[PDB]
Subunit: 259 residues, 3 copies
């Protein structure tokens, strides 16, 4: 009577296959649950809120802050001192002065902030001006104390520079992270400014900069996990249901073979 030994063999092979599938599903779901996957989405926005460009001039002085639309850069009429157009907020924080310039809105009309500095430097030998871009300009002027908020952004918001003698076309764009947080990233483009001034007044450098928006989109980053635990739990129920089914079918076939 070797029929019950063969029935125990096919039941042992069926529970071995069910235990192998139950190990492999839990191992694969834990492996896809360990490493998350970033998912990108481009939300279109027709008009941005006006950001703040917190420039840090050491001894430089702002000479222009004129907005220009539709990529129309005119020739500058003189490298002396004209009057500003945009609203500047000169504030002194300590964690240094931060000449905050209100940035551009209206991305579809291509608005830029052409600005121009000048510095007769004598102590430093690397002509740079740092800056830092935060998300909203009205949050600065609608604050009860500006030196708390600019201090707070001097720890988290990152600082780039531009050079002395070059127009630095800065094209910024937003990135929103979920999981909320909103940060900037820019791409400079250096173009040499040829001096056609007399050589008596060429001791002072000139710092041009163009800040515009790149494209009317906001990149959205969501951290997503590609493992499904509830589905995996169900899949284990469908395995543990067929481990009973195939054992009952083998118990029927083991008696039907000697009928």
């Amino acid at each position: 009577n070797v029929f019950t030994v063969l029935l125990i063999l096919i039941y042992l092979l069926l529970t071995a296959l069910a235990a192998f599938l139950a190990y492999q599903t839990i191992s694969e779901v834990l492996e896809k649950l360990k490493n998350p996957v970033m998912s990108v989405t481009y939300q279109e926005v027709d008009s941005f809120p006006r950001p703040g460009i917190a420039l840090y001039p050491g001894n430089a002085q702002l000479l222009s802050c004129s907005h220009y639309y539709h990529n129309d850069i005119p020739p500058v009429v003189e490298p002396g001192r004209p009057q500003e157009i945009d609203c500047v907020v000169t504030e002194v924080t300590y964690v240094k002065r931060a000449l905050v310039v209100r940035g551009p809105s209206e991305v579809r009309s291509k608005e830029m902030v052409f600005m121009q500095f000048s510095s007769n430097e004598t102590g430093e030998d690397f002509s740079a001006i740092s800056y830092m871009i935060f998300a909203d300009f009205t949050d600065l002027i609608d604050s009860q104390n500006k030196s708390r908020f600019m201090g707070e952004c001097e720890t988290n918001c990152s600082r780039w520079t531009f050079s002395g003698g070059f127009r630095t076309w800065v094209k910024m764009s937003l990135v929103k992270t979920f999981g909320d947080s909103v940060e900037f990233r820019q791409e400079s483009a250096v173009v040499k400014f040829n001096d056609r001034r007399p050589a008596a007044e060429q001791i002072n450098q000139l710092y041009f900069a163009v800040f515009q928006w790149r494209d009317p989109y906001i990149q959205q980053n969501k951290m997503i996990v590609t493992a499904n635990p509830w589905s995996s739990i169900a899949i284990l129920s469908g395995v543990f249901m067929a481990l009973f089914k195939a054992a009952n079918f083998a118990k029927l076939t083991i008696q039907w073979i000697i009928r």
Copy 2:
């Protein structure tokens, strides 16, 4: 006779667990169906088709367009006017002249397009030359009218610049998007050209540029969704099958306990 109340309790708990799994699977599949995932693939290509580099010189004049292999840049023999080598297509579109230069093929042999401009500028004060790279040069010369095709690429294809006085080593690479579309992206590298000319003829700037391919690969972008709706529908069938099974086993156990 409180046995039917306990059978209705275990059947209510089983259909509550089945309704909870049927809500959670549909919610998880809709959440993973909302946010897609970009998938990158690097198709290797041994030889690229020759692209077109649509330069926009304002008043500059091309002085060289010589190909060089194996990263061999020779010294330029004179900053005057030699003769060109590559094929230029001077065409006038309006949406400006677009001196289209046929780009490099043979990425494994490291072919580049060394070019040199010159401009005695008097009206502008930012020495830049814009350019724009489209995917195939033979599509321009095999067109019935070139001002339709260049006008079409002046809306979609993006424009970078290079400066006056610097060699701008542009290393381009393709990106193909699926979901078809093919676009470029480049990374410049500015190196200062020191003038060793007499100072009588230093009124005109010099614009050097090097266009080569970066690596023999084409990055392929496919938008992929990590949710499986057919599998989810099946998983719901396996849940709604075990909601009957466990209720039948509870109906057997409720009568077997008082046997």
Copy 3:
């Protein structure tokens, strides 16, 4: 007796639905198995091992290699020749001399390697100095022959340049790929150095460079496939179990309708 024709019709529709689900699950799992998905993870590291910056000066000579902490760049006391501080390894490979400079550790203290070159160039007309960053400096000095290891890194590790007359603030960061491999990527920032030297000794250029770490993180890249084959095999078992179940329920309902 048209009841068996209707039972064969509902059994044919049930095996058609089961064959459609069994085709669609295998097609969706093969489609999500064809295209893999890159997964990013940022492992924090409090202190990096010191890398090697394999500069290639043609005829330039190193004049300083001083470390500075906490973004404190002092004024350089003279553009002549001071003495070095960091350890340089001048070695001659051929696949050229490779003046290997030991890079910075201690990312949280913001350590940089300020260096300064000088070259009275007469044969070349593009003032550039190439470099190349490998992962560990002690692997070079703890090698039995340095010209094998530098040869081997001259094929795989990529080469950037910096210019003559500009401070090039290089901010490097690691990327580790799995599937092991470790590579660098940097982002330069060019700032013009204004010469305040007498014009008799301005025939030689000056090459400044700053090498620091960007942020205390190591980006980890794992290639992950979003398809689950074992789960798909199970899902097929749950489909092929319900194809029997619904056929048995239709066989019960076809006799219960004429009871």
